[PDB]
Design an enzyme around this catalytic site. Structure first.
Site, short mmCIF file in Angstrom:
data_model
loop_
_atom_site.label_atom_id
_atom_site.label_comp_id
_atom_site.label_asym_id
_atom_site.label_seq_id
_atom_site.Cartn_x
_atom_site.Cartn_y
_atom_site.Cartn_z
CG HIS A 75 -0.21 0.34 2.34
ND1 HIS A 75 -0.54 -0.47 3.67
CD2 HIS A 75 -0.21 1.60 2.81
CE1 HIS A 75 -0.16 0.63 4.18
NE2 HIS A 75 0.68 1.83 4.27
CG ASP A 89 -0.79 -3.90 2.82
OD1 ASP A 89 -0.10 -3.09 1.70
OD2 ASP A 89 -1.06 -3.28 3.67
N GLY A 125 2.34 6.76 8.96
CA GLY A 125 4.14 6.59 8.50
C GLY A 125 4.76 5.64 9.22
CB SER A 135 2.10 2.16 6.40
OG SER A 135 1.52 2.29 7.32
#
Lengths: 14, 245
Positions: free
Chosen positions: B46, B95, B194, B196
């Protein structure tokens, strides 16, 4: 909003 | 990271800081990642899906601060940006992403006091629910913050069972068995925007292991809304095949 959540970093709409 | 503590890269030396260069020359922080071998960083799809061009990105290892140099840091270009073909999208499926890194001099990561790899888990082998794990990143310190912290942070969260996370008042059908939920018992500390792509690390039978990758969540440090992490132990064949690219 959703643009301030984990999952939407580096996104065009955000 | 909401709550927790400031740290330096010596305390998470596999942590990769990923930035994107804009048209015009400006550089912005994108996401975290984890060094899993000298040439490979693992992160979240993502983070890259809207700008999948490898030339846009810069990866740092051995970096403790967001916008200043850390002594001993290494800077890399992205030789290949590999996204998971079954990605779907707030509750992102599959993801997970791989970045092959190469310096301007054509080299991969060189291990040091501030640069080390993290071990991958054994297949379908995860710690039991209630286990404490650590998360690391440069993400927001408060949901309402405009800026990212300048200094790396880490915190501790506890693993939540799929059974608990599947409850309607938690996340319901949004969370799958290829995902892991983790949170603080008082909901007072969490990953945030942030963070991630960054590491969720647990000690699995004595050894530090990359259990999860920061993926998604509704808000940050909110009651009944844990952080959701890509379950690394369910992607070993994908990692194995794609790291030969």
């Amino acid at each position: 909003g959703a643009c301030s959540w984990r999952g939407l970093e580096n996104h065009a709409m955000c | 990271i909401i709550g927790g503590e400031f740290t330096t890269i010596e305390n998470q030396p596999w942590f990769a800081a990923i930035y994107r260069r804009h048209r015009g020359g400006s550089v912005t922080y994108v996401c975290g990642g984890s060094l899993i071998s000298p040439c490979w960083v693992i992160s979240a799809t993502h983070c890259f899906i809207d700008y999948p061009k490898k030339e846009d990105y810069i990866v740092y290892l051995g970096r403790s601060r967001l916008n200043s140099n850390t002594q001993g840091e290494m800077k890399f270009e992205v030789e290949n940006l590999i996204l998971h073909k079954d990605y779907s999208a707030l509750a992102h499926h599959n993801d997970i992403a791989l970045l092959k890194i190469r310096s301007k001099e054509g080299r991969c990561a060189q291990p040091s006091r501030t640069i080390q790899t993290i071990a991958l888990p054994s297949m379908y082998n995860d710690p039991q629910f209630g286990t404490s794990c650590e998360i690391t990143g440069f993400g927001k310190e408060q949901s309402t913050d405009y800026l990212y912290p300048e200094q790396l942070k880490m915190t501790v969260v506890k693993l939540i069972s799929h059974r608990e996370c599947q409850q309607p008042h938690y996340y319901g059908s949004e969370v799958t068995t290829k995902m892991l939920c983790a949170a603080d018992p008082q909901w007072k500390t969490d990953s945030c925007q942030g963070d991630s792509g960054g590491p969720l690390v647990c000690s699995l039978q004595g050894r530090m292991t990359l259990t999860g990758i920061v993926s998604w969540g509704r808000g940050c440090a909110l009651k009944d809304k844990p952080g959701v992490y890509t379950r690394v132990s369910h992607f070993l064949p994908w990692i194995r095949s794609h790291t030969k690219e």
